[PDB]
Structure formats: C-alpha cells, structure tokens
Amino acid sequence: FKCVNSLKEDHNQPLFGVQFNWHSKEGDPLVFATVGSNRVTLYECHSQGEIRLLQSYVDADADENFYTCAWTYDSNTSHPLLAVAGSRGIIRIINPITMQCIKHYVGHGNAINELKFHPRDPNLLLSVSKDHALRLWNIQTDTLVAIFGGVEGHRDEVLSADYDLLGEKIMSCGMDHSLKLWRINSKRMMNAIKESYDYNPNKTNRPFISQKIHFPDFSTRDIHRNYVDCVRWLGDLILSKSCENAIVCWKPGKMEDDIDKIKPSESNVTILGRFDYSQCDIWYMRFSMDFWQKMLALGNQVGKLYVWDLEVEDPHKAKCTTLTHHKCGAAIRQTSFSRDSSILIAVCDDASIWRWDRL
C-alpha cells in the first residue's frame, strides 16, 4: 500500500462514514461515498491517485448529521442506491442516477448509528439505533418487517451490526458491552419477509404487522469490558472491538460448538485470539475487510491506519503493516476496501480523505 492522494471537504466536520460501491460493473470506475456534517458525497476513483468529485447532497435541515450510509440497487432498474442516516433518526434512499431523494423512513425514536443491506435481497435494510433497537426494513414495499429489541434486546445504544455472508443471521453490538445474534432464517422471520412483500396497502385497511423479536438467539457480555462499537462476521467466527485497543476474534459456545446449533441459552464464548494496535480508545472507530475477506484494516485516533492479512492462521503472528503519512494526523473514523482490494480509502475527524493503493 502507498498513499497517493488526500482530499478535504469544505465543511470541516468529521467524516463518520465511507463506503465503496461494491455493485459497479467489471470495467466501470470505482466509486465510493462519504458522509459527515449534513452531507452525502460521491467520488469516482481514477489512475495515478486522482479522485474525482461526482455528486454531493446536503440536508435541508441544518441539524441533520449523517453517521452512516450503505449501497444497494433497484433490481428492476439497475440503478445504484445510497441509503444514509444519522442523528435525526431518518433514513434516506438516494438515487444518484436521478439525483432524487426517492424514499425516506421515520420511525427510530433516536439516532441511527449504522446501516447495512441484505447480502442477497437488495430491498432489506437493517438500521441500528441509539433507541436501543435494530430495525429491518423492506424498502420495496415500504414496510417495517421487524424490530429487534425489547426485554432481552440491548439495554443501551446499539452501535453496530452485520449480516453474515449468506444473509441468514445478524450480530449486533453496543454500549451495554453486549453482542447479540439474531437469526432471520427462522420460520417466523422468513415468513415475515414473504408476508412483507405481499403487503398491499391499496387492498386493506390494516397496517402491516411488524415482528417484535424481543429475544436474541444468543447473547454475551464477556468479550469486552466496555461499549462495543464495531462488529463484523469473519465466516462463522466474529470480529469485534471496544476501546481496549484490540480487535477480538471469538465464537459463541464452546470450541467445537457449531454456530447453527448454539442454543439461545448457551453461556460459553470461545476467544480465538486478537489483533493488537494502539491509541484507539475513543469510541466510534470502525474497521472493515474486503469482499473476499482476506484483509482487515483499522484506522487510529492519531491518523494511523492498520492493515492485517487474515490469510494467516493465528492472530499473534498476523501479518500487519502500518500505513502512515506525515500529513495525516486526524483520527480515522472508518475505512473501506474497493471490491477488488486494489484501493483503500480512509476518512477523518477533520474532513480529510486519504486514498491508499495496493501493489
């Protein structure tokens, strides 16, 4: 990796989210997107480090403050779509081929801290919030499929969540020290998804019936000792971080226990090892991987950007390189690999963008 450009947006506000569009055709340019302040900004990546400004939106409301976004598409139109949201607890679906805000969803009773689309159904949007709940939307039929929370959901702000590779289960993390598994291939859930596609308001006087899933298929407060602010699956293992300056690699149950047989009362976790790094003990600092999940990259409170190679075995001897640059001193809030891992964008507490290239 070599650093080969650095951009600064005019607003001087922290950039909390960055996300490459992993739906680009083979041959189309690598586009990524940025959120911060009350703006959403798209960029095309070119050769020799050139980063080309494509579009940018600003919320009519001045006190919006976008924390996250995610790319999906419209099956029946092949247009990319960008979902974004933040502290006003509102989701917008932006259609960049048309420059509209085409949908929006009011509902979460507080700030949305993350957004993730379903790996295989472009229309299912999961949103994580400061109201202590997840929420799974079906954006085609405009229906709220399910609220993940309640008597055994998160006792406090939910900071992050992630679908597994196939789209069968979600894991979530948040300020209560807890990570949680929510299956969505129960008969109940798949049934609620189907039912949600069928919902036609023009043919009834009854509001669609949203699943109140009060109970996680598994819970634990035993990996970290402080709010948990990023979590992503690595296979059927789980990677998660707090502020104790280490990404932890763990699985629910005992060592040989199978993720799909883990029972909602299992009380064992198995820690497979961790990745070490320093000076990242402020909250809300997220990591990521490739589409192929061979590379793991995490940025710093002082401008440092780590990249581990998940190809090895043990975390201890995990191949780690530390990308650095004299000019990058801002805390890195999030990173993103282009689908083909060729590029690595990091964004910062100071409006700055840093593009790294492989080879």
């Binding site: 650095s6 095309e44 579009q55 600003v58 790996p119 109201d131």
Partner: protein, 463 residues
Amino acid sequence: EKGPICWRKRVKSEYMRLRQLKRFRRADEVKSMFNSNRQKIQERTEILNQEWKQRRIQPVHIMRECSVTSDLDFPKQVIPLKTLNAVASVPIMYSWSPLQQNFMVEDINDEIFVELVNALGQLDRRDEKPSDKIFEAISSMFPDKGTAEELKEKYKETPNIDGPNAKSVQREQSLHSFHTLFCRRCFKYDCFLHPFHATPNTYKRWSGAEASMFRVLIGTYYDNFCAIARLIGTKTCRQVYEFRVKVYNYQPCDHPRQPCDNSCPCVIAQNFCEKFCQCSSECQNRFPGCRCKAQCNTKQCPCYLAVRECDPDLCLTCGAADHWDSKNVSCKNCSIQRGSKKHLLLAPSDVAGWGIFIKDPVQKNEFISEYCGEIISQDEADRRGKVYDKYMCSFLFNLNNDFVVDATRKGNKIRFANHSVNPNCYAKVMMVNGDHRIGIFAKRAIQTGEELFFDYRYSQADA
C-alpha cells in the same frame, strides 16, 4: 511416601505440564478451525460473487456549491450542492416493552484439578519399585482452592415421575417443585409479581411412579383406596389397601395459634388481612367485602370507601364475581383487576415530546387506565434515579413505602401522559386483591381526542 518438598514439587511440575499440554491442544484446535472457517468463506463469497456477475449495475455519473481540495497539490474541484427536501422527524423515544400488569425485578478449575490428581495418582502408584499425601501437596500449592479435606471430596465428585427413573419418595418431595414455586395469588408458577415464598400453611387444608403417587394421593384422599385406586390407575380397591399396611405493602400473615392482635404484621402495617392470609376465618381484621347490589362507586359501598376494588371472592352480590365475559358489568369498581382500559392514541404532544389522547369520551371520575411498569425496591429506584437524572426525566412513581413502579423500561400507553399542574386526569392507588395498583381516572368529563395529563407531583410525595 516421598517427602513433602518432593510432592509439592511434583504438583508444580505436573500441573505445569498438564496446563502446558492443554495449551497446545487449543493452540491447534484454533489453528484447525481458522482454516475450516476459511474454506467456508471462500465457498460462500464465491456464491455472492457469482450473483454479482449476473447483475449489470449502472455507473454513477457527474452532476449552491461545494468544493474539495487536496493536501497533495491536486486541482481544486467544485460542483453543485443538491438539497434533499426537508422531512419531519418525530420526538425522541427509547425502546420499551408492553405490559398489561406490573412486573417485578429484584436488585485453576475443577476440570483440571482432577487430571492433576490422577497424574499425581499414577506416580504414587508407579512408586512401587487415591493417596492422602497428595491432596496435601495440592493444598499447599493452591491453598485457596481449599484444604486437604475440602479437596479430598471435591475429587470424589428432584426425581421426575413420568420418566423411567421415578424413585419412590415422600409426598412432600413429589410436590416440592409445585408447592414452593407456585403463587397462590395469581395461580401461576414462578409468577412475575410476588417474590415472597408461600408459607408452609398456605398449602395444607411397585415402581416409584406408583409408590410415590400413593404416598401423595393418601395425603389428599387418606384411606378411600376405592378412589386412590381409580386415580393411581393400575391398582385395585384392594391392592392399594394392601400396599397401605406395609401505606404499607400487603403480605399474607402466618402466625399459627396467634390471634391477629398488636403483634400481627398486617395490623402493625395498617392493612386488612385478606383471603390469602392464613389466620382464622373469624379474624376480626379480614375485609368483609361489600353486599352492594350494583354500582359500588360511592362512599355508600365499604370497598370503594376504603379505597379497595371489589374482590371476586367476597363481593358476591355486586356483580364483581360473575361474568368473566365483559368488562362492562354491574360493578363499576373492578376496572383494574379485569383490566378494562379505554382505547388511547399516541401522537406528538402539544406541549412537548410524546403525549397521549383518549379516543372516546369519558365522564368525570371514570377509570381510564392502569399506570403499569416494573416494581422495584426503594433502593433500586435510587440507583436508577442516578442514571435517570442525566436526562432531566423520570418515569418513577411511588407505589407505597416498599415499592416504586418505574415505567421507563416497561409499561403501557398511559405512560405517554404528560405532567401538568392543571390535569384532566388523576392517579389513585388502590388495593386490588392484595396488590397496590395505580389507577388513572378522569378529573372532569373529557371529549373525543383530548390530550391527557395528570399531576406527577403527588405520585412523588412518598414523604
């Protein structure tokens, strides 16, 4: 026989071996699974990457201003800033669960210890060329895990009746799980409202599967083996004959052979004894109930007067004990227990935040809803109010000297009613079959669609 210094050295040498042995086991167990995990990725990611090859997604294209610079001498870019048209947000709301009734909330390992013992054990055996000089060495090296004795037996280391292993047992041992773990009050097992265990007096008025069921059924049936047989199933009006010969919260009082006088908890606590009490039936302190014919919403009726709802097992005449069909009934004084709340609507308040609106009219003094939440000790309310003050907020409401009901985490829709010093509703805590509950009542008539308020201040004078 080898010498204490020696043995304790072995403890250390061996423990430190086993530990280090198991350290490597797992070392690989992990290495093993990180791989068998990787294939899983590969095989699945490919599936995704296939699906993505099928698709043909349109490229994003170029379009008030926004600029972007570049701390690497790249040309300033400038572009049109599009505005997303305003959308309205709703007020803040944190997750809560729906209640229709209050809910109570309260305020070197063994696996290896054994290997080391048998390790040590084999050396004491291999000596000749379960000992006691061994447990002593282990106690030396881990004096915290116990003494010799306590380890000497740690090492050495509730029937069912429908299953194959049904012992033959006492009758009070077949009914134990039931007797303790059941609420005479709500008729539920391990109920969600009543933590105190029922006193002993509150539950008194072949193969094991047969012997047990016998020693149990005789406690209830005694000597009528004609019936003891009919029930036991496969024995006889004989055979059984043959097997024979070989404001303070209320809590029920149980002081046998003691009158409910000045030493009785109920009388000290200023409460009436209730049906759940184990005192005489003659008890001068029981509450009679009313013999009203109907209504029961005036000082005329003794129950209403004493701020009680009617009791379906004492007020046999007002209509309170019949018609478990409708929530409209002769007796207007059992709205809480039967749970006959009014439809409420939730919309952003006209003052602040969320508020609550009644959907159909309502007369002066009519019941609107119960205010429900979790019951918690006065100390839990403390601890919790520390965390709450951050919010300049509170949905704590005193129930009595011992309990607070907190609607923060769970409750029902009347919790969205806002405070006012000029309310159209008020809160009255009533006794209801031995439970204090909060009933929200209208203060003056109220019309379709009005917003609901009551004065949080009295619910806060637990002085």
